[PDB]
Design a protein around this ligand. Sequence first.
Ligand code: ERY
Ligand code: GMP
Length: 300
Amino acid sequence: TVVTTADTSQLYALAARHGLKLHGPLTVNELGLDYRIVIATVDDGRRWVLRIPRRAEVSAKVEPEARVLAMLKNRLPFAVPDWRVANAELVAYPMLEDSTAMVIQPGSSTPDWVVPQDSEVFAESFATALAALHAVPISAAVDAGMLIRTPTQARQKVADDVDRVRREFVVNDKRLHRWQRWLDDDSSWPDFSVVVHGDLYVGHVLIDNTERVSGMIDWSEARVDDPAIDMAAHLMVFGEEGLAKLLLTYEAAGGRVWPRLAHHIAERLAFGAVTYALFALDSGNEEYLAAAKAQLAAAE
Ligand SMILES: CC[C@H]1OC(=O)[C@H](C)[C@@H](O[C@H]2C[C@@](C)(OC)[C@@H](O)[C@H](C)O2)[C@H](C)[C@@H](O[C@@H]2O[C@H](C)C[C@H](N(C)C)[C@H]2O)[C@](C)(O)C[C@@H](C)C(=O)[C@H](C)[C@@H](O)[C@]1(C)O
Ligand SMILES: Nc1nc2c(ncn2[C@@H]2O[C@H](CO)[C@@H](O)[C@H]2O)c(=O)[nH]1
């Protein structure tokens, strides 16, 4: 006998309760704070992703996300997870076998690989894919019960997040002033909202062998909100040059822009410190909290 991390008997029983018969290789990621993620082979010869909520508060999020994905399926020219099982104890979908646009070993802080800066096919297809997502009608989001933020509500959410961090943490004065100046800078903020992915970066984008965007995964943060939310990570990973190329093609593909969009994206990226700190706080994880506190106290 050999000790293995996966509990095959419990996983089999769980899947079988939802009409899936596990048979063959599987792999387990337990590093998620909210879900256990298993990639398992099923008797259809196919690999499936089992997204297993850990606790009642996580399970509560399954039904609304399922409605989002069901709405998005026909309205995007790329693949999203097809949640053929979606309930409080299990989400399961056939694996989208195309690679993520970055590869990282679980637990590692350094990727093995990220789609290259000079991949024009990736850059271009990510820009058009993003324009397509942001073109999903608001009416479809409303009909699917999505979280909707008007421009005023979008700005209020950012203000609320900043204020929550200010209450719970001690923040570098210049950082605080940056965020406040941003919140007060009317010209930075868009006069419309769009359907956003909400957690979009190379690790949640799938690409085919040619590096063309073919899918997006991990839609739990999707909502109607500020478009720049989905562009901050592109600026981090690909720099100002990558951002410039993105904005030209996004606009050419029909994406709605505004004159200070590039500036706003950079402020959104800086606001990632707030997002991280609140994630750390809500996680209860002391290592994440240690990192957040150190970042917040530090000068940018
Ligand atoms: C390049 C490759 C690296 O990716 C990033 O830099 C991108 C660009 C971050 O997004 C950036 C940009 C942005 C906008 O998110 C896309 C911003 O919100 C976050 C804070 O930082 C990611 C993804 C962050 O995750 C996000 O952290 C959120 C607190 C919660 C969110 N999710 C579970 C809800 C989650 O995905 C976060 C913190 O870096 C993940 C930890 C694990 C890492 O340190 C890992 C190792 C990363 O360094 C990375 C994978 O190697
Ligand atoms: N290539 C691929 N990776 C996935 C899929 N679903 C989940 N993942 C991986 O598992 C993580 C948690 O959902 C993701 O961030 C990816 O690394 C999928 O359908 N295709």
